[PDB]
Structure 1
Amino acid sequence: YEWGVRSTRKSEPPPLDRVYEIPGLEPITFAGKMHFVPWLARPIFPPWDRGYKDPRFYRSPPLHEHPLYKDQACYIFHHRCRLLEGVKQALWLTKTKLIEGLPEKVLSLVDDPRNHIENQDECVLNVISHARLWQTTEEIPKRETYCPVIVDNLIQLCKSQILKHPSLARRICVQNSTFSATWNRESLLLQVRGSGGARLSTKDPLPTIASREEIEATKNHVLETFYPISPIIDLHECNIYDVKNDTGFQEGYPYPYPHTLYLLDKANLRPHRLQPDQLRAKMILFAFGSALAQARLLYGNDAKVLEQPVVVQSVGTDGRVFHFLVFQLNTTDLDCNEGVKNLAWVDSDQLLYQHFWCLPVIKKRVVVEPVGPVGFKPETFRKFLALYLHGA
C-alpha cells in the first residue's frame, strides 16, 4: 500500500504536441508571444538559472554533494531524542553500569547540619510557591514558565551557601552552551550534540567517586542488551555530519570543567514532555557526551582506559519530579563491549512536591485543600544541594 493518493500527487504534465515528433520542422509556439495562447504549440523552455546568489531564494545542492556527506551513517542524539528503551539503551550506548542511589561521597556532604541552609524548608517552600503560583499575573503559570524558574531559584538558593563555602566562587551557570562528542560502539558511530541549557561550569574538575578497584570490578558486569530493538532506535540517522568533538568553548575559557548539566523538560503538553525513563536516558547521554568531550580535549582523541576518570553531574527535572545523576567516564575505549565500563549513579523520580494547588478547592463552601504545595519532600532538595556542593 503506497502512501499519497494520486489526486494529491503532482499532476502529470500534459502530453507533448505531436508537432514535436516530426524531425524536419520547427514547431510554432507561443514563446515569441511571451504569453500562453491555446491555439499554439506549448514551448519547451530550457532550464533556468538565476545566475547569482540570492539568500532568500536559495536552492541547496542535493544531499550527496555536500562537503561533509559520508557513506557511513552517523547516529546523532540531540536534546529532542526520546529513546525507546530509555535507560537501558543509554547505558548500552555509553558503555555504562548503573548504580541506584547517589554515591555516599556526595550524599554525605549534606549530612552535617552546617551545610544545611538556614530556614531551608521555608526557603524551598517559598521557591516552589514563587515558581508555581506567584510567578506571573496569570492565575496558573504554565510549565514552560515555572520549570526554568524553579530550577534557577533552587540554583540561587544553593549558591547562597557561598558564605560557608568560598570555593563556590569558582563556578558559573552558563546558558546556551552546546557540546558535541563522537564515539564508536560495535562499528556504529554515535554522536551526541548536547544543547539543553544551564551548564554549571567550575574552574576545577570534580573528584573521582569510583576507586580503581571498583572501576576494574566493572569489568565483570555484563552490558545488558535488548532484542530485537537495536540500540540505534530513536537516534537521528544522518549521512551528512562532522566527526569533530567540541566542548562548546574556545580554548582558554575559564570554568572549562563541566560540573552539572541542568536539563529541564518544560513542555506544556504531556506528549511533548519526556517520560521519566527517557529523561534519565537523556541525562545519561548528555553527561557522557560532556565527559567524553572533556576527555578528548585533555588526553587526546585516543581510545584508552582513562587514568583520571572524568566526573560530570546532571539534574533532569520536569519542574516537580527530579532525577539526579553522577556519571564517571573512566574509559574512551567504547567500541568493545568488554573491559572497564563507565559508571553512573542515578536517583530516579525524586519528587519535590507531589502536587500543588494554585486555587483553594472548595466543597460545599468548605475549603478542603489550602493554596500551596502539599506533600513537600525536603529529601529531594537535600540531594539537589549535595550535588551542588559536591566539589566544594
Structure 2
Amino acid sequence: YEWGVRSTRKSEPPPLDRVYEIPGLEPITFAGKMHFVPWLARPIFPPWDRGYKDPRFYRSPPLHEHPLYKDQACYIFHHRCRLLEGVKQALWLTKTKLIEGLPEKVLSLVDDPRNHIENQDECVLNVISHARLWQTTEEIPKRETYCPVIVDNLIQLCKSQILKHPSLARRICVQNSTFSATWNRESLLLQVRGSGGARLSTKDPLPTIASREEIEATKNHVLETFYPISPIIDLHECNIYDVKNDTGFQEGYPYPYPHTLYLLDKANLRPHRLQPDQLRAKMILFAFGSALAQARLLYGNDAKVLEQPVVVQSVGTDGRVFHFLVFQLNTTDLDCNEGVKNLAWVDSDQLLYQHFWCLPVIKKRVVVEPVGPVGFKPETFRKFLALYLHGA
C-alpha cells in the first residue's frame, strides 16, 4: 500500500505539443507574447538561475552537498528525542551501570541539621505556593509557567546557604548553554547535542564518588541488552553532523566544570511531556554528554580509562516530580562492551508534593481540602539541597 492518493499528488504536466516532435521546424509559442494564450504552443522555458539566492527566497542545497555531510550516519540525541527503552537504552548507549539511590557521599551532606535551612519547610512551601497558585492573576498557572519558577526558586533557596558554605560563591547557573559530544558504540557513532537549560557551572570539578575498586568492579557487570529493539531506536539518524566535542563555552571561561544540569519538562500537554523513564534517560544522556565533553577537553580526544573520573549531576523535574542523578564518567573507551563502565546513581520519582489544590473543593457547602499543597515531602528537597551542596 502506497501513501498519498493520486488526487492529492502533484498533477502531471500536460502533454507536449506535437509540434515539438517534428525535427526541422521552430514551434510558434506565446513566449514572445509574454503571456499565455490557448491557441499557441506552450514554450519550453529554460530553468531560472537567479532565483534561490536571495536570503528571503533561499533554497538550501541538497543534503549531499552540505559541508558536514558524511556517508557514515551518526545517531544524534537532541532535547526532543524520547528513547523507547528509556533508562536501559541510555545505560547501553553510555556504557553505564545503574545504582538505585543517591550516593552516601552526597546524601550525608544534609544529614547534619546545620545544612538544614532555617524555616526550610516554610520557604519551600512558599515557593510551591507561589509557583502553583500565586504566580499570576490567573487562578491556575500552567506547567510552562510553574516548572521554571519552582526550579529557579528552589535553586535560590539552596543558594541562600552561602552563609554556611562560602564555597558556593564559586558557581553560577548559566542558561541556554549547549554542549555536543560524540563517541562510538560498536561501530555506531552517537552524538548528543544537549541544549536544555540551567547548567550549574562551578570553578572546581566535583570529587569522584566511586573509588578505584568500585570502578574496577564495574568490569564484571554485564551491560543489559534489549532485543529486537536496537539501541539506536528513537535517535535521529543524521548524515549531516559535526564530530567536534563542544563544551558550550569558549576557552578561558570561568566556572568551566559542569556541576548540575537542571532539565525541566515544562510542556503543558502530557503527550508533549516526557515520560518519567524517558526523562531519566535524557538526564543520563545529557550528563554523559557534558561529562564526555569535559573529558575530551581535559584529557584529550583519546579513548581510554580516565585516571580522574568526571562527575556531573542532573536534576530532571516536571515541576512536581523530580529525578536526581549523579553520573561518574570513568572511561572514554566506549566502543567495546567490556571493561570498566561509567556509573550513574539515580533516585527516581521523588515527588516534592503529592498534589496542589488551586481551588478549595467544596462538597455540600463544606470545604473538604483547603487551598495549597497536599502530601508535601521535605525529603525530596533534602536530596535537592544535597545535590546542590555537593562539591562545597
CA distance in 1, matches of 2:358, 2:85: 35
Q: Distance in 1 between matches of 2:64 and 2:28?
A: 40
Do the aligned residues in 1 keep the contact of 2:51 with 2:57 (CA within 8 Å)? no
What per-residue deviation string (whole Å, max 9, x for no partner) do you get for residues 169-200 of structure 1? Answer: 00000000000000000000000000000000
| Structure 1: distance between partners of 2:207 and 2:109 | 13
Could you report, residue by residue, the CA deviation over 1:241-297 in whole angstroms, capped at 9, with x for unpaired residues?
A: 110000000000000000000000000000000000000000000000000000000
Separation in 2, partners of 1:14, 1:78: 45
Q: CA offsets per residue over residues 185-232 of structure 1, 9 Å max, x none?
A: 000000000000000000000000000000000000000000000000
**Which runs of structure 2 are paired with 1:165-314 in the superposition (5 Å)?**
165-314=165-314
Deviation of 1:59 (Å):
1.1
1:12 aligns with 2:26: no
Q: Is the 8 A contact 2:53 2:59 kept in 1?
A: no
Given that residues 357 and 369 in structure 2 are in contact (C-alpha distance below 8 angstroms), is that contact kept between their aligned partners in structure 1?
yes
SS at match of 2:375: strand
What is the CA distance between 1:146 and its match in structure 2?
0.2
In structure 2, distance between residues paired with 1:39 and 1:190: 60
The 4+ residue runs of structure 1 with deviation greater than 2 A are none
1:131 aligned counterpart, secondary structure: helix
Does the Cα contact within 8 Å between 2:182 and 2:243 map onto a contact in 1?
Answer: yes
Matched residue SS, 1:258: strand
Alpha-carbon contact 2:283-2:325 (below 8 Å) kept: yes
Cα offset for 1:67? Answer: 1.1
Deviation digits for residues 339-388 of structure 1, max 9, x if unmatched?
00000000000000010000000000000000000000001000000000
Q: C-alpha separation between the residues in 1 aligned to 2:79 and 2:45?
A: 47
C-alpha displacement of 1:95: 0.1
Mapped to 2, the partners of 1:200 and 1:41 lie a distance apart of: 69
- Aligned to 1:376, the other structure's residue is in SS state coil
Give CA-to-partner distance per residue, 1:128-182, whole Å, 9 cap, x none.
Answer: 0000000011100000000000000000000000000000000000000000000
Give the match's secondary structure for 2:345: strand
SS across alignment from 2:354: strand
Query: 1:60 Cα shift?
Result: 1.0
Is 2:55 aligned against 1:55? Answer: yes
Give the percent of matched residue pairs that are identical in Structure 1 and Structure 2.
Answer: 100
Task: Give distance in 1, aligned partners of 2:51 and 2:382.
Answer: 65
- Residue 50 of structure 1, CA deviation: 1.0
SS of residue matched to 2:356:
strand
Residue-by-residue CA offset, 1:93-138 (whole Å, 9 max, x unaligned): 0000000000000000000000000011111100000000000111
Structure 1: gaps of 5 or more residues: none
Deviates more, 1:50-59 or 1:78-87: 50-59
Closer, same or farther in 2 for the Cα pair 1:52/1:77, shift >3 Å? Answer: closer
1:95 aligns with 95
CA distance in 1, matches of 2:268, 2:155: 22
CA distance in 2, matches of 1:241, 1:289: 16
CA distance in 1: counterparts of 2:332 and 2:63, whole angstroms: 32
SS in structure 1 at match of 2:72: strand
Mark the runs of 5 or more structure 2 residues left unpaired by the alignment: none
What TM-score, normalized by structure 1, do the two folds share? 0.99
Match of 2:328 in 1: 328
How far has the Cα of 1:43 moved from its partner? 0.4
Q: CA RMSD in A?
A: 0.6
| Counterpart Cα distance in 1 of 2:126 and 2:23 | 88
Deviation at 1:336, TM superposition (A): 0.2
Conserved 8 A contact 2:69-2:241: yes
Distance 1:239 1:346 in 2: 33
Q: Distance in 1 between matches of 2:95 and 2:146?
A: 35
Deviations 1:48-92 (A, max 9, x none): 111783100111111111111100000000111000000000000
Residue-pair matches, total: 392
Q: Distance in 1 between matches of 2:352 and 2:52?
A: 58
Indicate the larger mover: 52-61 or 357-366: 52-61
Name the CA distance, whole Å, in 2 between partners of 1:357 and 1:182: 45
Question: How far, CA to CA, are the matches of 2:72 and 2:191 in structure 1?
Answer: 13
Distance 1:136 1:110 in 2: 33
Task: State whether residues 96 and 344 of structure 2, in contact with CA within 8 Å, keep that contact through their aligned partners in structure 1.
Answer: yes
Distance 2:303 2:278 in 1: 28
Instruction: Give, in whole Å, the separation in 2 of the partners of 1:372 and 1:92.
Output: 42
- Take 2:336 and 2:114, find their aligned partners in 1: how far apart are those partners? 45
Q: Secondary structure at the match of 1:10?
A: coil
